[PDB]
Design a protein around this nucleic acid. Structure first.
Length: 157
RNA sequence: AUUAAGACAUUCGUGAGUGAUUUAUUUCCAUGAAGUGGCGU
């Protein structure tokens, strides 16, 4: 609702959208006749630019065991430095939902051409809105390891 | 000399045509770079 103009979305609509974005199918096992460009591709995120400084730094995690009377255990690992630009690459398309089902672009054109076309049952999320949705998710939870203890959180450049 | 003698079941013919080992899956979960002061009464 935040990223797109859709006022109301149903649980089945959310399920269909998720299975179209990630599985590229229907919630079940059925295949939708999709075009070449109607596929969601998640490329590799690369380090883009370390402005003034290196991109790799060293950090410590020092577990203290169940016995506080015993010595700690310094663990040294390699991390990506803060203030480093990460480039996320996606190949996203426009998702067409009609009557809580995912439709192809030509399918949705044919549906639009029909007489009993209910505009209330038609929903569309574009590639830009998909990118905004993914950006919000990434800014919410982050990416990588030890995300619960803070590592891998991102800010807008 | 006898309903007999002669007569290749043979000629031509691609196991070939269409087909993505692909789809779904976070190398992640837990973890304090911490602990302690000592002597000169």
């Amino acid at each position: 609702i935040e990223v797109t103009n859709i006022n109301e979305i149903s649980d089945t609509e959310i399920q269909a959208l998720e299975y179209a974005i990630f599985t590229n199918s229907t919630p079940s096992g059925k295949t939708i006749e999709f075009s070449l460009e109607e596929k969601d591709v998640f490329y590799d995120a690369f380090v883009a630019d370390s402005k003034d400084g290196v991109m790799l730094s060293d950090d410590y995690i020092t577990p203290h065991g169940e016995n506080p009377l015993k010595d700690p255990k310094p663990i040294l690992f390699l991390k990506i430095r803060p203030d480093v630009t990460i480039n996320f690459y996606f190949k996203l398309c426009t998702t067409h939902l009609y009557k809580e089902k995912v439709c192809s672009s030509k399918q949705i054109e044919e549906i639009k051409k029909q007489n009993d076309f209910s505009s209330s049952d038609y929903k569309m999320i574009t590639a830009h809105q998909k990118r905004n949705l993914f950006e919000k998710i990434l800014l919410c939870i982050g990416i990588g390891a030890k995300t619960n203890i803070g590592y891998g959180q991102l800010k807008k450049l």
